[PDB]
Amino acid sequence: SHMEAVQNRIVEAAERVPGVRGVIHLRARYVGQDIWAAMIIGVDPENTVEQAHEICEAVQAAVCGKIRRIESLAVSAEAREIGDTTKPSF
Amino acid sequence: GSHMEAVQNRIVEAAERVPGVRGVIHLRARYVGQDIWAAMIIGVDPENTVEQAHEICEAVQAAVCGKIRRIESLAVSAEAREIGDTTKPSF
């Protein structure tokens, strides 16, 4: 819950990137005042593997751009169906 | 860790038989208790769909977990790999 606000900022940043259907999972830790994090995003299942990689790169740039305290971020992509409203796991 | 090395090679060989696997990019394996927990990244055609790539991952899981009894957990994820790429698996 001391992680809560920052996790929500990261999710919100990622979810405003074109091609992102939602964030599936986010592992984030503080190390001092820097953040290290790994995120799984959901994308159209009919995107190609190369398309999905591009969206992952876009999320990395956007999230790091908005949340400057992030020192390291990994992003990976999995299939998500268009009406899935399942909340992110943390 | 010659014994774990041996196990790793057996996982790679089982994975690389699976249709759609261009090669294993990465494998991390370790004992958690007396079982093995492992995570592997496989290389696949970049033109696969995400859902296609997932099925290949599930095919690999079934194949590996069927040959190596001691693996309790195996996570498999897919990344783009070009067809003539030669880089061997990393550990």
Author numbering:
A (entry chain B): 212 to 301
B (entry chain A): 211 to 301
Paper text:
One group of metal ion efflux transporters that regulates metal ion homeostasis and can be found in all domains of life is the Cation Diffusion Facilitator (CDF) protein family. One of the most highly conserved and abundant integral MM proteins is the CDF transporter MamM. MamM was recently proposed to function as a magnetosome-directed iron transporter required for iron biomineralization since its deletion abolished magnetite biomineralization and mutation of residues within the conserved TMD metal-binding site resulted in alterations of magnetite crystal size, morphology and even mineral phase. To summarize our results we present an alternative model for the CDF CTD mode of action, in which we propose that upon metal cation binding, the CTD induces conformational changes towards a tighter and more compact fold which allows the activation of iron transport through the TMD.
To gain a better understanding of the contribution of these binding sites to protein function two double alanine point mutations were also analyzed. In vivo the introduction of double point mutations in the central putative binding site (D249A and H285A) resulted in decreased Cmag values similar to D249A. Although the average particle number per cell was almost identical between the D249A and the D249A + H285A strains, the latter strain produced particles with significantly reduced mean diameters (−12%, P<0.001, Mann-Whitney test). In addition, this strain also showed a slower restoration of its magnetic response upon induction of biomineralization by adding iron back to iron-starved cells. ITC results for the central putative binding site double mutant (D249A and H285A) displayed a reduced number of binding sites (1.8±0.2) in reference to the wild-type data and therefore suggests that a single cation binds to each peripheral binding site. To confirm that these observed phenotypic differences are due to true transport function alternations, we also examined the expression levels of all MamM mutants, their ability to stabilize MamB expression, performed MD simulations for dimer stability evaluation and determined their CTD structures. (ii) All mutants exhibited an apo-MamM CTD-like behavior along the MD simulations, and (iii) an absence of structural differences was observed.
